[PDB]
Design an enzyme around this catalytic site. Structure first.
Site, PDB file in Angstrom:
ATOM      1  N   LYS A   1       0.804  -1.226   0.000  1.00  0.00           N
ATOM      2  CA  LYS A   1       0.000   0.000   0.000  1.00  0.00           C
ATOM      3  C   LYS A   1       0.841   1.283   0.000  1.00  0.00           C
ATOM      4  CE  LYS A   1      -4.003   2.197   2.014  1.00  0.00           C
ATOM      5  NZ  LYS A   1      -3.335   3.501   1.751  1.00  0.00           N
TER       6      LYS A   1
ATOM      7  N   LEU B   1       3.006   1.923  -1.938  1.00  0.00           N
ATOM      8  CA  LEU B   1       3.291   2.167  -3.350  1.00  0.00           C
ATOM      9  C   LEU B   1       2.102   2.864  -4.026  1.00  0.00           C
ATOM     10  CD1 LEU B   1       4.950  -1.292  -4.354  1.00  0.00           C
ATOM     11  CD2 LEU B   1       6.043   0.844  -3.605  1.00  0.00           C
TER      12      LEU B   1
ATOM     13  N   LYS C   1      -6.339  -7.841  -0.734  1.00  0.00           N
ATOM     14  CA  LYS C   1      -6.181  -9.032  -1.569  1.00  0.00           C
ATOM     15  C   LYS C   1      -4.768  -9.550  -1.453  1.00  0.00           C
ATOM     16  CE  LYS C   1      -9.772  -8.300  -5.116  1.00  0.00           C
ATOM     17  NZ  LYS C   1     -10.610  -7.388  -4.267  1.00  0.00           N
TER      18      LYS C   1
ATOM     19  N   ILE D   1     -11.689 -10.474 -31.497  1.00  0.00           N
ATOM     20  CA  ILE D   1     -12.822 -10.740 -30.617  1.00  0.00           C
ATOM     21  C   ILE D   1     -12.563 -10.003 -29.296  1.00  0.00           C
ATOM     22  CG2 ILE D   1     -14.215 -12.472 -29.379  1.00  0.00           C
ATOM     23  CD1 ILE D   1     -13.502 -14.541 -31.187  1.00  0.00           C
TER      24      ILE D   1
ATOM     25  N   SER E   1       8.615  -3.684 -27.666  1.00  0.00           N
ATOM     26  CA  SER E   1       9.527  -4.303 -26.695  1.00  0.00           C
ATOM     27  C   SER E   1      10.927  -4.532 -27.283  1.00  0.00           C
ATOM     28  CB  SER E   1       8.949  -5.617 -26.173  1.00  0.00           C
ATOM     29  OG  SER E   1       8.710  -6.538 -27.232  1.00  0.00           O
TER      30      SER E   1
ATOM     31  N   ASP F   1       5.368  -9.427 -30.532  1.00  0.00           N
ATOM     32  CA  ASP F   1       5.152  -9.237 -31.962  1.00  0.00           C
ATOM     33  C   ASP F   1       6.187  -8.263 -32.520  1.00  0.00           C
ATOM     34  OD1 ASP F   1       4.282  -6.675 -31.172  1.00  0.00           O
ATOM     35  OD2 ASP F   1       2.704  -6.655 -32.739  1.00  0.00           O
TER      36      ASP F   1
HETATM   37 MN   LIG Z   1       4.688  -5.138 -29.759  1.00  0.00          MN
HETATM   38 MN   LIG Z   2       2.180  -4.674 -32.085  1.00  0.00          MN
HETATM   39 NA    NA Z   3      -9.094 -10.372 -28.692  1.00  0.00          NA
HETATM   40 NA    NA Z   4      -0.517   3.467  -2.275  1.00  0.00          NA
END
Ligand SMILES: [Mn+2]
Ligand SMILES: [Mn+2]
Ligand code: NA
Ligand code: NA
Ligand SMILES: [Cl-]
Ligand SMILES: [Cl-]
Ligand SMILES: [Cl-]
Ligand SMILES: [Mn+2]
EC number: 2.7.7.7
Length: 326
Positions: A51, A53, A63, A97, A171, A181
């Site tokens: 917390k 953070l 949780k 989708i 990335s 990808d």
């Molecule tokens: Mn990518």
């Molecule tokens: Mn991409």
């Molecule tokens: Na999707």
């Molecule tokens: Na916090």
DNA sequence: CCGACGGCGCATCAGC
DNA sequence: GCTGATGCGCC
DNA sequence: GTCGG
């Protein structure tokens, strides 16, 4: 991965809120907390410690305490056991989708991979292709293959017009040893913020990649953004490489720095950074950084000759792509 | 207690 | 056809 | 779900 168990939990909660609840702010809140926790350099011993953070609040702290005590979250235990939620979460893994379409399909009795395969005529083009390569799209891309793909794209682009510059971002540019990808930013001096002296600039490039059987399918395409599928060539007698997603974004050449900032990401890094700009009186997009005026409205584009310039405006120390993996 | 939470490209559709 | 709403996507 | 004001 000091707190992999916690960040996995939060990511699962985020996915649930997005795909099933359709609560997009809860989705963003969970991803933000997972991110702030992922980079925190201690193994978390309590919710109260988490917390401290920013992004982690009372609910997430609770949780976290349950998860550390028992190794699970009852809330997710139940979500898992729910047939409609499980189906909806599964269908949304197919490109094209989303939460809405997944719910609709589940309503019509289409809720598995086999159901989808026999109901191909109920899918739009994008979904048809997402289904076609469902398995392949779940595989990651080793950096070595990303390097092979980079060479093909850059060299083929060179063959269309030596004035193109293609830059692989996402990335890859952040130095990841594996990528989801391939993202390619494209510039050409015919296309700037001031004029489009040459039509078909993106199409031409797509065509050339299609000609050498690198691009194999198209999910969507327009004048500035292409979304499709590609595949590395295999050697004699060797198994085929998996089909991969590719995104190509043509950006005005004079706006390359805002564009490469955008396309480098991460997505969470971008949200965080753009939120901070607002707090400092600026708005950032893939094109420009502009001042907020006294009323709600944005001023003229501020001059930019480097990625670092954008960081300066909003009073952030510059961050190298490798440290933008939020 | 509240309002805001990043910004935008392409596909599809309903209404005109 | 146009335009705006909505879905799904990108980082 | 979390945050600043
Ligand atoms: Mn990518
Ligand atoms: Mn991409
Ligand atoms: Na999707
Ligand atoms: Na916090
Ligand atoms: Cl929400
Ligand atoms: Cl769990
Ligand atoms: Cl702009
Ligand atoms: Mn992504």
């Amino acid at each position: 991965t000091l707190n992999g168990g916690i960040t996995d939990m939060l990511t699962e909660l985020a996915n649930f809120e997005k795909n099933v609840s359709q609560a997009i702010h809860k989705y963003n809140a969970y991803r933000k907390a997972a991110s702030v926790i992922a980079k925190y350099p201690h193994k978390i011993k309590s919710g109260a410690e988490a917390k401290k953070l920013p992004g982690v609040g009372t609910k997430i702290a609770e949780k976290i305490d349950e998860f550390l005590a028992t190794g699970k979250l009852r809330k997710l235990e139940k979500i898992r056991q729910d047939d409609t939620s499980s189906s909806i979460n599964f269908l949304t893994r197919v490109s094209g989708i989303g939460p809405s379409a997944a719910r609709k399909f589940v309503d019509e009795g289409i809720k598995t991979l086999e159901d989808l395969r026999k109901n191909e005529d109920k899918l739009n083009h994008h979904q048809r292709i997402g289904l076609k390569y469902f398995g392949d799209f779940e595989k990651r891309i080793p950096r070595e293959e990303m390097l092979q793909m980079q060479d093909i794209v850059l060299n083929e682009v060179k063959k269309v017009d030596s004035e193109y510059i293609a830059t692989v971002c996402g990335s890859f540019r952040r130095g990841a040893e594996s990528s989801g990808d391939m993202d390619v930013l494209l510039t050409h001096p015919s296309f700037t913020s001031e004029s489009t002296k040459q039509p078909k600039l993106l199409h031409q490039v797509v065509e050339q990649l299609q000609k050498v059987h690198f691009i194999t399918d198209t999910l969507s395409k327009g004048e500035t953004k292409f979304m499709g599928v590609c595949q590395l060539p295999s050697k004699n007698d060797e198994k085929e490489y998996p089909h991969r997603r590719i995104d190509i974004r043509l950006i005005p050449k004079d706006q390359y720095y805002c564009g490469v900032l955008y396309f480098t990401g991460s997505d969470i890094f971008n949200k965080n950074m753009r939120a901070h700009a607002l707090e400092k009186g600026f708005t950032i997009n893939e094109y420009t950084i502009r001042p907020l005026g006294v009323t709600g409205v944005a001023g003229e584009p501020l001059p930019v000759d480097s990625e670092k310039d954008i960081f300066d405006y909003i009073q952030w120390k510059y961050r190298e792509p490798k440290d933008r993996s939020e």
